[PDB]
From a paper:
The SARS-CoV-2 Omicron variant of concern evades antibody-mediated immunity that comes from vaccination or infection with earlier variants due to accumulation of numerous spike mutations. The Omicron spike (S) glycoprotein, which promotes viral entry into cells, harbors 37 residue mutations in the predominant haplotype relative to Wuhan-Hu-1 S, as compared to approximately 10 substitutions in both SARS-CoV-2 Alpha and Delta VOC. The Omicron receptor-binding domain (RBD) and the N-terminal domain (NTD) contain 15 and 11 mutations, respectively, which lead to severe dampening of plasma neutralizing activity in previously infected or vaccinated individuals. To understand the Omicron antigenic shift, we determined cryo-electron microscopy and X-ray crystal structures of the spike protein and the receptor-binding domain bound to the broadly neutralizing sarbecovirus monoclonal antibody (mAb) S309 (the parent mAb of sotrovimab) and to the human ACE2 receptor.
S309 recognizes antigenic site IV whereas S304 binds to site IIc and was used to assist crystallization. Our crystal structure of the human ACE2-bound Omicron RBD elucidates how the constellation of RBD mutations found in this VOC impact receptor recognition. We recently reported that the SARS-CoV-2 Omicron RBD binds human ACE2 with a ~2.4 fold enhanced affinity relative to the Wuhan-Hu-1 RBD. The N501Y mutation alone enhances ACE2 binding to the RBD by a factor of 6 relative to the Wuhan-Hu-1 RBD, as reported for the Alpha variant, likely as a result of increased shape complementarity between the introduced tyrosine side chain and the ACE2 Y41 and K353 side chains. Omicron S residue Y501 and ACE2 residue Y41 form a T-shaped π–π stacking interaction, as previously observed for an N501Y-harboring S structure in complex with ACE2 (44). The K417N mutation dampens receptor recognition by about 3-fold likely through loss of a salt bridge with ACE2 D30. The Q493R and Q498R mutations introduce two new salt bridges with E35 and E38, respectively, replacing hydrogen bonds formed with the Wuhan-Hu-1 RBD, thereby remodeling the electrostatic interactions with ACE2. Finally, S477N leads to formation of new hydrogen bonds between the introduced asparagine side chain and the ACE2 S19 backbone amine and carbonyl groups. Collectively, these mutations have a net enhancing effect on binding of the Omicron RBD to human ACE2, relative to Wuhan-Hu-1, suggesting that structural epistasis enables immune evasion while retaining efficient receptor engagement. However, the region comprising residues 366 to 375, which harbors the S371L/S373P/S375F substitutions, deviates markedly from the conformation observed for the Wuhan-Hu-1 RBD, irrespective of the presence of bound linoleic acid.
Residue numbers in the entry:
A (entry chain A): 1 to 213
B (entry chain G): 1 to 214
C (entry chain E): 19 to 134, 139 to 613
D (entry chain I): 332 to 529
E (entry chain B): 1 to 228
F (entry chain H): 1 to 135, 141 to 220
Write the structure that this text describes.
Amino acid sequence: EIVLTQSPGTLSLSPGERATLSCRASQTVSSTSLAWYQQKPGQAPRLLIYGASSRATGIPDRFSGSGSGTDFTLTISRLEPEDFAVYYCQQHDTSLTFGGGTKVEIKRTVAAPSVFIFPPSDEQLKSGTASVVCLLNNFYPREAKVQWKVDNALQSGNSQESVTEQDSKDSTYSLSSTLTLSKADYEKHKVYACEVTHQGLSSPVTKSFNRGE
Amino acid sequence: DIQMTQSPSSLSAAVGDRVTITCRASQSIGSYLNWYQQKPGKAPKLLIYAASSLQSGVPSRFSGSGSGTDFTLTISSLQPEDFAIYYCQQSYVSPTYTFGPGTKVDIKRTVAAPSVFIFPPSDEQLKSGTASVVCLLNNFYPREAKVQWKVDNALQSGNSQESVTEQDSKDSTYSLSSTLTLSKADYEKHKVYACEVTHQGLSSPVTKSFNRGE
Amino acid sequence: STIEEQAKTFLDKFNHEAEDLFYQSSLASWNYNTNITEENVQNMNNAGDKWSAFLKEQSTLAQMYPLQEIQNLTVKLQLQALQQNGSSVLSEDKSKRLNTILNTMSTIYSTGKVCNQECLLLEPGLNEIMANSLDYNERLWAWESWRSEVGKQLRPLYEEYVVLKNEMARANHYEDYGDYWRGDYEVNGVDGYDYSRGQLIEDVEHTFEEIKPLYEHLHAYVRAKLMNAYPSYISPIGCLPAHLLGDMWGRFWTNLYSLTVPFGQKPNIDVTDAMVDQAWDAQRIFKEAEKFFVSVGLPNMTQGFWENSMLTDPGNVQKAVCHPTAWDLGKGDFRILMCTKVTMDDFLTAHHEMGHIQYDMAYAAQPFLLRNGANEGFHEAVGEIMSLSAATPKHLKSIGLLSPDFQEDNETEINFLLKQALTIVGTLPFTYMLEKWRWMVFKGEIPKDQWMKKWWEMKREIVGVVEPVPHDETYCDPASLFHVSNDYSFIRYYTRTLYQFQFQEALCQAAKHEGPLHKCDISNSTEAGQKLFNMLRLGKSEPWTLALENVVGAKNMNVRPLLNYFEPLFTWLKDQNKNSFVGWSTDWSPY
Amino acid sequence: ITNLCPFDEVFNATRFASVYAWNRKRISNCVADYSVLYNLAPFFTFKCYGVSPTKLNDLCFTNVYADSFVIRGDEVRQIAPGQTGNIADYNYKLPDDFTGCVIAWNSNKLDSKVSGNYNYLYRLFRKSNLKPFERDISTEIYQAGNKPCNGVAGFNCYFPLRSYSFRPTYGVGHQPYRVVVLSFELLHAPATVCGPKK
Amino acid sequence: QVQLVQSGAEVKKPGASVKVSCKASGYPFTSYGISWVRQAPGQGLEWMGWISTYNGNTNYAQKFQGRVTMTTDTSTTTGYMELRRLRSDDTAVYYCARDYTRGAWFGESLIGGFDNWGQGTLVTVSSASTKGPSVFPLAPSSKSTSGGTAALGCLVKDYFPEPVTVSWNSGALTSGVHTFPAVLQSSGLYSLSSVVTVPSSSLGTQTYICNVNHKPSNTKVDKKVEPK
Amino acid sequence: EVQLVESGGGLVQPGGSLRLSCAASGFTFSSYDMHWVRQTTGKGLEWVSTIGTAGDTYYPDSVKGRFTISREDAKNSLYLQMNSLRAGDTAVYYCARGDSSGYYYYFDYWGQGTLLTVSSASTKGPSVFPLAPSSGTAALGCLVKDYFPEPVTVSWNSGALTSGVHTFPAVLQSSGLYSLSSVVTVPSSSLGTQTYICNVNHKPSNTKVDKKVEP
Ligand SMILES: *[C@@H]1O[C@H](CO)[C@@H](O)[C@H](O)[C@H]1NC(C)=O
Ligand SMILES: *[C@@H]1O[C@H](CO)[C@@H](O)[C@H](O)[C@H]1NC(C)=O
Ligand SMILES: *[C@@H]1O[C@H](CO)[C@@H](O)[C@H](O)[C@H]1NC(C)=O
Ligand SMILES: *[C@@H]1O[C@H](CO)[C@@H](O)[C@H](O)[C@H]1NC(C)=O
Ligand SMILES: *[C@@H]1O[C@H](CO)[C@@H](O)[C@H](O)[C@H]1NC(C)=O
Ligand SMILES: *[C@@H]1O[C@H](CO)[C@@H](O)[C@H](O)[C@H]1NC(C)=O
Ligand SMILES: [Cl-]
Ligand SMILES: [Cl-]
Ligand SMILES: [Cl-]
Ligand SMILES: [Cl-]
Ligand SMILES: [Cl-]
Ligand SMILES: [Cl-]
Ligand SMILES: [Cl-]
Ligand SMILES: [Cl-]
Ligand SMILES: [Cl-]
Ligand SMILES: [Cl-]
Ligand SMILES: [Cl-]
Ligand SMILES: [Zn+2]
């Protein structure tokens, strides 16, 4: 089995800059049997390069394929806004396998997250459950750290995080952290805090509320 | 590519003669051989294709033969209208079709002496500053002829150029021009302008002359 | 199966494998020479050693086909090139003895240095003095210290080297080791083109007699100019002191141009200023050279040439060898490795090197064993004629590096021809006399107790050059030259110099050049280029006498075309020397 | 018949055969669109024998064969009727009366390696020339002298195949070329392969 | 002008079987094979197999040899993929693509790739059953910065299967809205949050209504979000 | 019936570009292959290009990168775009129709030919001078002097007088200009009855001269 490894997983670059994506194989791959694919969010993959070098029909000339043996490269000469997507290399030299994909991300200045916290609604408590949402709004880079505190007790295993796609206009992210607790467990404690550590914050921002208030 | 070789290079034949021309292919081309005729000033004319099929409108005296590597074109009875260069062409390898070198068929006929005329330079040319004296030998056979310019009986060298027509398709003769070119200054330095023509159709050289004073 | 077709079948197996292994070795060398690293040294040696092992095995296998049974000359030449025994006939002791002497003599030359606190090497130290110094005693010190320090160390080794080499040559059925070297010009079995090894001596001596008047007048002129710098040391009738010849050995008198220039106030033609102002590039230089060969009907350079050649300095981080070299790696891979600078000398060198490439490309159709010049002198002769044509004012004027209003100058031309004579004419008596001494030493005509005696007897008589210090038989002044210490034949430079003017004359006659030969450029003459190609295509497959005929129409080496090149200078020299002593006395000595 | 002949499968195949072991594809019971040939920018070799490349979409044949292999650039001239050389003599021989087309193109970007590609072989030694369309895949030792080889390679006893050893810096005459030979066969049999609308 | 159109979404329970169709148009159907590729949510691409449209020869990935069966109909120029013995891991979008990596006639590898791709079919495998979403208000803070931006939102909790459509004020609000990707909960149901940022002054004068539609359960919900 | 008419010839500088045009009549042009063939004194007839009925085009290696054949079936027209023209392209170019009888292929109809000259020299219009007859049968003609490049067309009485006409091959003069003589031999009785006029055409310079010749 030939495993294709694409590094890095996420490539942050400014628009118009030159992008070079690497595809490394566990065995020597015939150039005749390596291909590249682009996939935008919510769309189907489209073929960019086949035969390691040949551009597919209708692919702009800024896309280029190179490399041989175990190391292959896809080059975008000048990144357009439409070029920021996930790219997969593919081989059919032995069986057929895809790489893991590299996400081409718009590089941006550091934007600190605006932090908001929401207590559970009374309607949800009547339903026998309580979920607390913490919002990080319009931040970059994507790597934020979010900690849930309940009466100073660090929470683990009961929180889920969801992140938006990168914004088309301001190139920031938004992230939701949802702490989920039992009705009885929520009413058992008092202070619920969401503490956010991010590169853009001079010190960690903590948002909190008291259960009754 | 396939290299084509024609033999003979040039051929003198009489009217009514059976002419035979040969075409050699660098490798077997089966019957994928065409023959063409070309007359002076004209495009080639297809005569034969598939080594033996007579093209529509081609007189029946033309015929092709041969297969594989050696091919022949035959004229059963050469007509005066047959003086031309004949090319073969292989159609086996494509698209790079190739042609033979050509076989030029000259026609033999009886001796005909040239009619000789001399032309003084026009006044219009003299106004431009140069004098051209032209000697014309018309409808003679064979092609070999000698013309000499004598200016006040001094034989000229290096200041004349000759031109000869292709063999006439009707009467199988040749015509020849000799043009003596002199500066307007040089033209007036002398009086008697003559060209002396030697041709095997004449008992003795023929001289045509004129006095510049006209 | 006859033995002749078995050899044909064997050569087919050899030719296939040889091209692959030679390419790997050649490409490995390129990777080192362009990218000096210890890793590439190992790659160069590993591939080169694997090639030498393959040749070793195949050469033994080739010797299984008795050459006397092979009638086909092309097969006979190919087998002969592999069947070379050489030192392999010597015993293991004598083989190790000679290789030890060769490596020792070579190292003594490469590492020898005169010292006193601080030491000076030959290059650049002593060579800078011999080329630039105007001090009689400083040049004498450098000249004498090199021969005493290095030459005396080589002297006892060279005596053993001569005995071991002659023993090797006699084992290979040659008369002596000089007869062995003359084997490169030997042609047998081709009636009307044969050439005996002894005929090389007769042809060299015959041609050398005809250049003596030109050299003697140049010697007379240079002597007269040299005395205006060393009037208290130079006799008007004697030989020239060996340390005053702008060179450590007097091999080239080019450095004497500053002292002997006939019209020093008139500058020489340097188009470097025109190239720089026009913002020329190294690739532009080679494109103009490529245009030159195309003009005579030769092919363009290959796509691989433009992609793989290193035509510029590889920058500061990557170290490379900057000697101008043309590379024939085989299998259609042609490269030039040159650290080009935007200058006229590199412009002329690019034509010279590409002349090798054009020669390489021409004989690429020959079998692997036949892919070389017709003899040791052919390749450089083809290179030199390109620099000759490109350096002409007409060519430089046609390519726009000289303004079309450039003035014809008799004096500038005499300046050029004289500087050419200092490098070309002056080299031939030194070159002939040197190889003459070696030939006689190998032949045993000079006893060991008279090596240096007869050496300086010849330099006085033949070269017109006398030693400033008397040397006894502890010295070995010939071995103080690279080629003598490193076991290289030297007559190659004599024959090559004669061939190149035979080529240039014949090609300009084909180009219908009217005027002096030194002003001819073969540009745009396909008739000349076709006549040249008729020789290049042969390589080694035909006798060099036949290959030479394909260019000049004659089977023999001829010096008269070289004389026609210098005929304008020779006439001027005869006039200048009328008031001067021409010829030398061998009795006078500075000591 | 509505199915198109699989010409694309041959010209755009990832791997090609060694010339000594040349591959044969039988194309039949299909409609052929020679548009793949016509829409080539001709740095590609394209020589046809017996029929002209314009008249191909008006033709029908009983069978089309597609032979394919890799050779050196200097050997492409041998893939033609009446040729000689190692390839025509010992590897792949077209008949004198060949009717078909030979198509070739440089494949240096695919078949060369910096380390040398030794996977492509050709037959260098055989005591007789091949008949047309003969395929010799034997690796028996070639006896080049009077003494028997007894299955051992050695003096006068040569392994008959050799590698091209393609490297990307080779000259064009030594660079690899992929070759497809289309042979057009017509016997006393119903036609199976026709041009568009015949 | 080539289009490959796939069947609509399928929701299955473990152990069941699913068959996905792929109607191709606009090219010589029998000259190109069909390749099937699936993509789990958030994961990379995973090739499943290849079928020749000419003779029906098939190549499958070892991961699926026993479970997958591919079929083609030449008449309707349609490819089929059947996957048996479904598991929760099989919840993925399944793509059909026009294949130029293997030959339809001879079955040998070709220089090319998957040039044309279908829009994809979402197949969800879970033991859960169709349920409409519970919608809860994410009320803005009682201590919102009056001279600044304030955040409010909507919680779309416990629904199955994907997808949910969320709009704000029936589309009257679109600037500042972030509707997050759904996350599968340990219960087996999907959950989602949708938030909007607004001026704090506007909080007392503007009404904000969360519009939630879940077509897989024929559920449509409108939750008013109020400060308290 | 079938006619092919060449056009677009003349002089072009080395490295220049020029388009030949060929117009066809008397057959369904869309249904036939078209070819370009050229002729040189040294190399003979060389095939230059082929265009089929399906957009397929063919070239030899000598022109593969430089020449482009095209056809315009809407106007029964054929074109040859020539770029990077070298001196060796100096030739008479014929457009020809191709046909086959089964497998055997042939060029059945050819145009008149057009002369292409690739030279650094400049165009020069001819000077036309009368060769007046002297004072039986008598001879008269026109001297077409000092022109470049070839060809000049010469006719008599707008083509009415073809019998007895001898237009001589052009002689290249040391000046690098061609000169040509055309003569017609006529009955002396008609020197008063008929006016003999040569029509000289030099398309490379748009020089058209009708010179009248009288005793
Ligand atoms: C020089 O050689 C080293 C290995 O010795 C290699 O890694 C490097 O790439 C080479 N540099 C160039 C420019 O070829
Ligand atoms: C020698 O043999 C080679 C190869 O068989 C052949 O090409 C050549 O013509 C032969 N030479 C002679 C003089 O027979
Ligand atoms: C040689 O190469 C130049 C480009 O450097 C090109 O313009 C020219 O046509 C070539 N000539 C030949 C004969 O290949
Ligand atoms: C050679 O020909 C070229 C192009 O015709 C021209 O530029 C160059 O000046 C010519 N050189 C000579 C020496 O005639
Ligand atoms: C230059 O050389 C020519 C040829 O020998 C000669 O005629 C001319 O007189 C020389 N110039 C001068 C100034 O003497
Ligand atoms: C080869 O593949 C390319 C890309 O899939 C395609 O455009 C071309 O038409 C194919 N040609 C043949 C002959 O298969
Ligand atoms: Cl695509
Ligand atoms: Cl795109
Ligand atoms: Cl596959
Ligand atoms: Cl908050
Ligand atoms: Cl010997
Ligand atoms: Cl060198
Ligand atoms: Cl010395
Ligand atoms: Cl040398
Ligand atoms: Cl194989
Ligand atoms: Cl995969
Ligand atoms: Cl079916
Ligand atoms: Zn050199």
